[PDB]
Symmetry: C3
Subunit: 334 residues, 3 copies
């Protein structure tokens, strides 16, 4: 008996985000999404380390879902028979039934349809949570993503001024726990089930072997660097479903940052580094002022440089010598 218009969304793989309006004149609708779970062995680093991943829609992170406050989000969650485990979905944006987890447990070969009303604005984690010790295991295996619930009037700075982004990227950060054998090489496994005992043992010690963006070391570099132009306002949504992170744009700032990720709160301004609490998403916007390469990292630099947690931006435009200039290039000391 919920008589509103229905709108289908075609999700796109991260770090890109499906097309959407910021401010809208649409009223509430039932926005329809489909997520199909895929368990798969993937490569996570440039050395060829493999990993028993569990994913929504084939990606780590799962895709970003975007709706507006007061929309109803109707998700068909599909667990094909080619998977081995039960799965479900918990939306941190939703109210009741463990975020939906208690209404969405599906065995291989099943699907379920959950609807929730988007009553809270912000960016939020979604993740699998089948019960007990399986909860962390599915999450750290990759079964997490995010959903953005925009105000119908779009974003604002808390001081009456609209904040409109020219583009948005979703960076999902994943702590991974890959065991090593006696001589110190990473182990490979034939199935997630086979990976579980060694993986849980390592998980409980709370030190990841890898911390990656978009599912692999280097995922958001080279051909797949993020991009912008001088003058463009870019929103960067960052999530971490299990473990804290401290994002930083090297050579830039967070002009407007919602580190707790919730648009009912005004953004902070002019940050160097912000903090994503494990189990949350946050967002930062920056207007690029200088061309060139930037790195986007977690600012535990050991994690960034040595465990995988670095993305790049390639930015086009004109250099601004007022903001920064090399007065004297490297030369012998007099």
């Amino acid at each position: 008996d919920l008589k509103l218009p229905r709108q289908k969304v075609e999700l796109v793989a991260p770090p890109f985000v499906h097309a959407h309006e910021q401010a809208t004149k649409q009223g509430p609708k039932i926005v329809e999404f489909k997520l199909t779970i895929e368990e798969k062995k993937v490569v996570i680093d440039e050395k060829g380390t493999t990993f028993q991943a569990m994913t929504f829609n084939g990606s780590m992170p799962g895709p970003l879902m975007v709706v507006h406050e007061g929309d109803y989000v109707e998700t068909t969650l599909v667990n094909p028979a080619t998977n081995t485990m039960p799965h479900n979905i918990d939306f941190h944006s939703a109210t009741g039934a463990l975020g939906g987890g208690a209404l969405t447990l599906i065995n291989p070969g099943e699907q379920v349809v959950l609807r929730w009303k988007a009553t809270k604005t912000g960016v939020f984690v979604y993740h699998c949570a089948p019960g007990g010790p399986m909860i962390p295991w599915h999450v750290v295996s990759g079964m997490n993503g995010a959903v953005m619930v925009l105000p119908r009037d779009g974003l604002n700075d808390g001081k009456g001024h609209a904040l409109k982004y020219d583009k948005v990227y979703y960076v999902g950060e994943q702590d991974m726990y890959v065991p090593r054998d006696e001589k110190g090489n990473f182990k490979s496994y034939d199935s997630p089930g086979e990976a579980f005992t060694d993986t849980e043992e390592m998980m409980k010690k709370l030190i990841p072997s890898h911390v990656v963006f978009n599912g692999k070391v280097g995922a958001l570099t080279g051909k797949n660097a993020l991009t912008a132009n001088v003058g463009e306002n870019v929103l960067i949504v960052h999530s971490q479903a299990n473990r804290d992170s401290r994002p930083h744009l090297i050579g830039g700032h967070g002009d407007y940052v919602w580190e707790t990720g919730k648009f009912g709160n005004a953004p902070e301004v002019g940050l160097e580094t912000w903090f994503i609490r494990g189990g949350s998403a946050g967002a930062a916007m920056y207007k690029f002022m200088q061309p060139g390469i930037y790195a986007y990292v977690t600012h535990n630099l050991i994690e960034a440089a040595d465990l995988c947690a670095t993305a790049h931006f390639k930015v086009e435009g004109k250099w601004n010598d007022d903001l920064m200039t090399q007065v004297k290039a490297p030369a012998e000391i007099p």
Copy 2:
């Protein structure tokens, strides 16, 4: 020569909180509390692991003390002769003498009486701190609690509106360090002194064996689940005296959150997950909208599901299908 009325409080064990007013028409009083230190061997998990605990009033955490801004808090701290170690108390709410620690060092068989003026509003940690390496050891052995200093007009949202809670719970989170023997079983000790060398060695490696609420795995589940009804506004005070935490109510939100815990600051609104800095208390209020079971966790889900850090709420009332509904129950994929 401090000539104000005296009021005794009968403390109650966590997660419950002694009776108190939110807004009050009372002026300042001298509010009298007694804390009696107990060292004791306790069971911390469902496997029967034992732990050399050190407690205020027999509990982990120590009980929540509640006063109003401008009250004087007069604590009789008692260290019975049946204990083995010196102890003291540091109130993060207090000004001077290391929070009181420098005025309250008592050997077994002694007591001391400290008064401090409640000039800062919020929730605050209190903990033992006898000196040097004993400081962390006593804290991580359980010797910590919290004190709430309310505004005399009660809580507000920073926008002129009163925030009144229907009930309050105190969740004290404890990082514990229980060593293992060569084959990998947790060790048991005959006294705290005997536990110290192995425990310190483990402590310095900064990875707990257990992270619990209310002193044990499962403490706030089953018979001892937290409770609410749909429509009730519940305040959840969360403390962690030594290590960070990231609280999250699964299936709910933080409607109003003071993550740094201090009522001179407006609350943030509509959070998914908040952050308790080690060495602090914070508070979150939520009005329940849906019946059923909720889990309240730290959202490092490894800690929550595998190391002990999960509580439950059981909530009574009517399900709201507008907020959430299972449109199609699990079924075979077409």
Copy 3:
């Protein structure tokens, strides 16, 4: 063609800060600083453990640079031929070229001059970042400091009132990774290069052996305790270039705290413990109310008491019995 007045600054070693104005009637100037890199073996604890340090200006942290919004900061970075490695500098306060890192890479025997416009207010990290895995290694070897960019009208409370400090201290916190040999003693190395392989192995495990202020256990105690008088407002700038911290003044508070460190945001009030995200600086001001000794710690008390992260303040003045009093000294229990 940048035609502004030039002003030289003589930097001073932490925890002290070079002389500067808070509010100023000066307009923009080119403020000139020199940093000379020194690699050196130092002692980091009272047991005589040694450490292959890499420093700006000989200190850990590097010195605090202080300017005003809209100044241009012109740094001559010098890498003497007596050093072994290339080095550079990344200012989190600066815009473009990886914070300056991409314009300042200098081999031993070279210097470079970088200018950047101080368009963002707050306290910010600066650090070396030569590329790749060298980034974390140089940072955790000591190559980090901070720069404070004040509003030209000085600090304010966000409610229209000026906040003027009577003194400022800079506490730089350093996570250090010193490997151990088979029997468990800390290793010593003949050069940073020789320390690298064992040090990187340890770094990737994300547990420091030492967490210190001002470069060594006990650096800011005894003769070198911080000082104040009752009635003095002290600003404490705290930085951590790689790893989170949770500052706390034992026996005091943070009266006004910018935990994310950026003066475009109002301070929070009345904190017990605040949070410095790794890769940032923050600042807290406190007006002392009581004489005596205070400890300033990270409130992971294991880190504070056992790994090195404790400073002291010695405060002169008159005790205030209204704020705190020992009603009854320790005595036998009746």
